[PDB]
């Protein structure tokens, strides 16, 4: 016999994948998904995904297993920085913006968004951070915007040589190559069998 409790609604997976606008990488949005049924079939009929790679679970088996505290976070990067969203990877995003733990149990989903997140003359609403004092620990959001001191001269007075603004914008233009077009990334993270389950999916 199989017993699962009483749950009403169907999880906001359409709400996080189909939205009007996403958030920048330096300020990635985070949504808590709980007390619903997680049918992972609305994911497949969405887009021809550029990358659907799952760590710790196999992509067909997520219906007939379940878990707790599933987390959904989203941001927008370019073409060549998709490979940086992985455990044990280094780079500008991976060390300064968004760091994944080495032992990661989840899935990474990315697809092209050149038609939406790009405009003629450049779309300057998607930023990413270049400079910090040190690296970034996993699952930390760094929103603070203060001037980074690159030279020996202490630049207290703001906006001078060798004291730089910490945020640079992505320049998205529709006629770019595939390596520099925007890509919407959604990363799912959950924990497998060490806590009581709160989301499971198909009841029987």
């Amino acid at each position: 016999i199989v017993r699962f409790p009483n749950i009403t609604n169907l999880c906001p997976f359409d709400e996080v994948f189909n939205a009007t606008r996403f958030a920048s990488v330096y300020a990635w949005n985070r949504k808590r998904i709980s007390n619903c049924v997680a049918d992972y079939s609305v994911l497949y009929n969405f887009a021809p995904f550029f990358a659907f790679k799952c760590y710790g679970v196999s992509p067909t088996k997520l219906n007939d297993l379940c878990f707790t505290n599933v987390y959904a976070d989203s941001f927008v990067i370019r073409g060549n920085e998709v490979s940086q969203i992985a455990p044990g990877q280094t780079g500008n995003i991976a060390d300064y913006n968004y760091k994944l733990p080495d032992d990661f149990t989840g899935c990474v989903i990315a697809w092209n968004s050149n038609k939406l997140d790009s405009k003629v003359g450049g779309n300057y609403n998607y930023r990413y951070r270049l400079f910090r004092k040190s690296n970034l620990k996993p699952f930390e959001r760094d929103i603070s915007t203060e001037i980074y001191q690159a030279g020996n001269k202490p630049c207290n007075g703001v906006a001078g040589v060798n004291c730089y603004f910490p945020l640079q914008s992505y320049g998205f233009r529709p006629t770019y190559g595939v390596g520099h077009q925007p890509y919407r990334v959604v990363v799912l993270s959950f924990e497998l069998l060490h806590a009581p389950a709160t989301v499971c999916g198909p009841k029987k």
């Epitope: 730089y164 640079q168 320049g171 770019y176 390596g179 520099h180």
Partner: nanobody, 129 residues
Framework: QVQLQESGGGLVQPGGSLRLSCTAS????????TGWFRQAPGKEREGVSC????????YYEDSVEGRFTISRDNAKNTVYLQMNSLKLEDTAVYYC??????????????????????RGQGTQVTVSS
Amino acid sequence: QVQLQESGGGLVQPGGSLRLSCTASGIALHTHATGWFRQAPGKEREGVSCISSGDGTTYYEDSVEGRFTISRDNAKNTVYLQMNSLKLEDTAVYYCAADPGAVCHSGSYYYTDDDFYYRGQGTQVTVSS
């Protein structure tokens, strides 16, 4: 508050040479891509050169190949245009501009379409007398 400031120009005799300098206050180079454009009296503006963000692939126009060079020094945060063998129709005003990303010739794009986000005041060169 990001200003791009230029130094150079003057009265140069044909066969001469200058070194134009563009300095960035707020932003940093080797992350942006800076380029030089020029305006002649009664004419429209045209590109001169481009350098990309990392390392730097140098792109030159059909009028100034083999004569001009572009070079970026990230210690003083300066970009430099060495102009050599100046002929008489090079009398123009020169602007330096910066744009985020490896902007010039990515895909089916090229920097002659002037849409750079940062601009400058400009310096006048005069090749005559």
